[PDB]
Enzyme design. Structure first.
Site, mmCIF file in Angstrom:
data_model
loop_
_atom_site.group_PDB
_atom_site.id
_atom_site.type_symbol
_atom_site.label_atom_id
_atom_site.label_comp_id
_atom_site.label_asym_id
_atom_site.label_seq_id
_atom_site.Cartn_x
_atom_site.Cartn_y
_atom_site.Cartn_z
ATOM 1 N N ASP A 138 0.837 -1.195 0.000
ATOM 2 C CA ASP A 138 0.000 0.000 0.000
ATOM 3 C C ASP A 138 0.877 1.252 0.000
ATOM 4 O OD1 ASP A 138 -2.432 1.317 -0.122
ATOM 5 O OD2 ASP A 138 -2.850 1.180 2.025
ATOM 6 N N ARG A 142 -0.211 9.085 0.184
ATOM 7 C CA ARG A 142 -1.116 9.221 1.320
ATOM 8 C C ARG A 142 -0.661 8.426 2.547
ATOM 9 N NH1 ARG A 142 -3.663 5.957 -2.147
ATOM 10 N NH2 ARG A 142 -3.955 3.862 -1.360
ATOM 11 N N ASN A 143 0.161 7.416 2.325
ATOM 12 C CA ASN A 143 0.662 6.586 3.418
ATOM 13 C C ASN A 143 2.103 6.904 3.793
ATOM 14 O OD1 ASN A 143 -1.774 5.192 3.686
ATOM 15 N ND2 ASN A 143 -1.209 3.743 2.063
ATOM 16 N N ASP A 156 1.500 3.211 7.689
ATOM 17 C CA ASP A 156 0.383 2.356 7.267
ATOM 18 C C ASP A 156 0.782 0.912 7.011
ATOM 19 O OD1 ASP A 156 -2.152 1.471 6.358
ATOM 20 O OD2 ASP A 156 -1.549 1.904 4.290
HETATM 21 C C1 LIG Z 1 -1.815 18.346 8.676
HETATM 22 C C2 LIG Z 1 -0.780 17.867 9.671
HETATM 23 O O1 LIG Z 1 -1.345 16.886 10.541
HETATM 24 C C3 LIG Z 1 -0.350 16.246 11.342
HETATM 25 C C4 LIG Z 1 -1.019 15.441 12.450
HETATM 26 C C5 LIG Z 1 -0.060 14.430 13.078
HETATM 27 N N1 LIG Z 1 -0.113 13.142 12.415
HETATM 28 C C6 LIG Z 1 0.678 12.143 12.780
HETATM 29 O O2 LIG Z 1 1.772 12.360 13.282
HETATM 30 C C7 LIG Z 1 0.202 10.740 12.583
HETATM 31 C C8 LIG Z 1 0.829 9.428 12.852
HETATM 32 N N2 LIG Z 1 2.067 9.229 13.382
HETATM 33 N N3 LIG Z 1 -0.034 8.464 12.506
HETATM 34 C C9 LIG Z 1 0.221 7.159 12.616
HETATM 35 C C10 LIG Z 1 0.662 6.382 11.551
HETATM 36 C C11 LIG Z 1 0.924 5.026 11.671
HETATM 37 C C12 LIG Z 1 0.756 4.365 12.874
HETATM 38 C C13 LIG Z 1 0.317 5.061 13.984
HETATM 39 C C14 LIG Z 1 0.055 6.422 13.899
HETATM 40 CL CL1 LIG Z 1 -0.517 7.301 15.352
HETATM 41 C C15 LIG Z 1 -1.202 8.903 11.995
HETATM 42 N N4 LIG Z 1 -2.323 8.303 11.528
HETATM 43 C C16 LIG Z 1 -3.342 9.079 11.090
HETATM 44 C C17 LIG Z 1 -4.502 8.489 10.600
HETATM 45 C C18 LIG Z 1 -5.550 9.287 10.150
HETATM 46 C C19 LIG Z 1 -5.464 10.677 10.180
HETATM 47 C C20 LIG Z 1 -4.325 11.319 10.659
HETATM 48 C C21 LIG Z 1 -3.250 10.570 11.122
HETATM 49 N N5 LIG Z 1 -2.138 11.187 11.589
HETATM 50 C C22 LIG Z 1 -1.132 10.393 12.019
#
Ligand SMILES: CCOCCCNC(=O)c1c(N)n(-c2ccccc2Cl)c2nc3ccccc3nc12
Length: 275
Positions: A138, A142-143, A156
Site C-alpha cells: 500500500d 497518502r501513506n 500504514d
Molecule cells: C496536517 C498535519 O497533521 C499532522 C497530524 C499528526 N499526524 C501524525 O503524526 C500521525 C501518525 N504518526 N499516525 C500514525 C501512523 C501510523 C501508525 C500510527 C500512527 Cl498514530 C497517523 N495516523 C493518522 C490516521 C488518520 C489521520 C491522521 C493521522 N495522523 C497520524
C-alpha cells in the site's frame, strides 16, 4: 504485540487534540514522557469503544509489524497501551501530515532538490522494509508522513505481509506481490511527489487504469519534471518486474541526483503515454 511493542504507562501520555479519523478509531496528538523523563510529541491512535476482539487484533497487528522496524524513514512506534482503555498505539509525531495532502498545499513551491530529498527518504525506508522481508502493498503518498523538517517516513502497515492505482500489473492480475511490486508503487509515489499530490490516473475508471497500464501506457511526465526522475518512474514501471531497479539502486540513483543538482537541468496524442 509485546514481542515488538513496549507497554506504555497511561500516566505518561497526555492527549492534547483529535487530529484525524482512523479506521479503528480517532487519531490524536499529544505528548509522551519517556523513562528518562524526556518529553516528546507523539501521534496517538485509539481503538474505538465497543470494539470487537477481531478489531483489537487487526488494530494491534499494525503495531506488531511497525515495531519490527527501527529506521529513520519508517514511522517509529513508541509503544502501545493495552492494559488500560482506550487501547492505544503511540508513534512519533509528524507535523506536516500525509505527504500527498502536504504537497497539494504547496504546488510548485519546493525546489527539485527538496523533492529529491523527500523521495530519497522514502526509498531508504523501503530499502529497509524489503531487506526485512516485508512487502508493503500500500505504498502511496497518502501513506507517507512528513515531519517539520520535511523528512518523509513510511507509514500504514495494515496491508503488509487493494489500491489499484498504486499496484503493479502482475499484483492486480494474479496477486503477485513482491518487493518489485513495491518498486512499481514507489514509481507511482515518485510521480505523485513531482506532481505535488495529483491523483495517479486522475479519476479514470479502475477498469481503464488496469487495461491501459497492461497495454503499456504510462503516466505522463509531471510539469517541469527532470528527465532523470521521469526515466526513474519508467524504470520502476517496467512490465517485466525483474527489470525494475531494486530499492538499493533507487537510493543510489537519488543520492547521485542530490550530489550533482545540475544534472536535474534536463527537463522532459493521449493523456497517458505509450511507455
Ligand atoms: C496536517 C498535519 O497533521 C499532522 C497530524 C499528526 N499526524 C501524525 O503524526 C500521525 C501518525 N504518526 N499516525 C500514525 C501512523 C501510523 C501508525 C500510527 C500512527 Cl498514530 C497517523 N495516523 C493518522 C490516521 C488518520 C489521520 C491522521 C493521522 N495522523 C497520524
Amino acid at each position: 504485540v509485546h514481542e515488538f511493542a513496549k507497554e506504555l504507562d497511561a500516566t505518561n501520555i497526555s492527549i492534547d487534540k483529535v487530529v484525524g479519523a482512523g479506521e479503528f478509531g480517532e487519531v490524536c496528538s499529544g505528548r509522551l514522557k519517556l523513562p528518562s523523563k524526556k518529553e516528546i510529541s507523539v501521534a496517538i491512535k485509539t481503538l474505538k469503544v465497543g470494539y470487537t476482539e477481531k478489531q483489537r487484533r487487526d488494530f494491534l497487528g499494525e503495531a506488531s509489524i511497525m515495531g519490527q522496524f527501527d529506521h529513520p524513514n519508517i514511522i517509529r512506534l513508541e509503544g502501545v497501551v493495552t492494559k488500560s482503555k482506550p487501547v492505544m498505539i503511540v508513534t512519533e509525531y509528524m507535523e506536516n501530515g500525509s505527504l500527498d495532502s502536504f504537497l497539494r498545499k504547496h504546488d510548485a513551491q519546493f525546489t527539485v532538490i527538496q523533492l529529491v530529498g523527500m523521495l530519497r527518504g522514502i526509498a531508504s525506508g523501503m530499502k529497509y522494509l524489503s531487506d526485512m522481508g516485508y512487502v508493503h502493498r500500500d505504498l502511496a503518498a497518502r501513506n507517507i508522513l512528513i515531519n517539520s523538517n520535511l523528512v518523509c517516513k513510511v507509514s500504514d502497515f495494515g496491508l503488509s505481509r487493494i489500491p489499484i492505482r498504486w499496484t503493479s500489473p502482475e499484483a492486480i492480475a494474479y496477486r503477485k506481490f513482491t518487493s518489485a511490486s513495491d518498486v512499481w508503487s514507489y514509481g507511482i509515489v515518485l510521480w505523485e511527489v513531482m506532481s505535488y499530490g495529483e491523483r495517479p490516473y486522475w479519476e479514470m475508471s479502475n477498469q481503464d487504469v488496469i487495461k491501459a497500464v497492461d497495454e503499456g501506457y504510462r503516466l505522463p511526465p509531471p510539469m517541469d519534471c527532470p528527465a532523470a526522475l521521469y526515466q526513474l518512474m519508467l524504470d520502476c514501471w517496467q512490465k517485466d518486474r525483474n527489470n525494475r531497479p531494486k530499492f538499493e539502486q533507487i537510493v543510489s540513483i537519488l543520492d547521485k541526483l542530490i550530489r550533482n543538482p545540475g544534472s536535474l537541468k534536463i527537463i522532459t496524442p493521449s493523456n497517458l503515454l505509450l511507455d
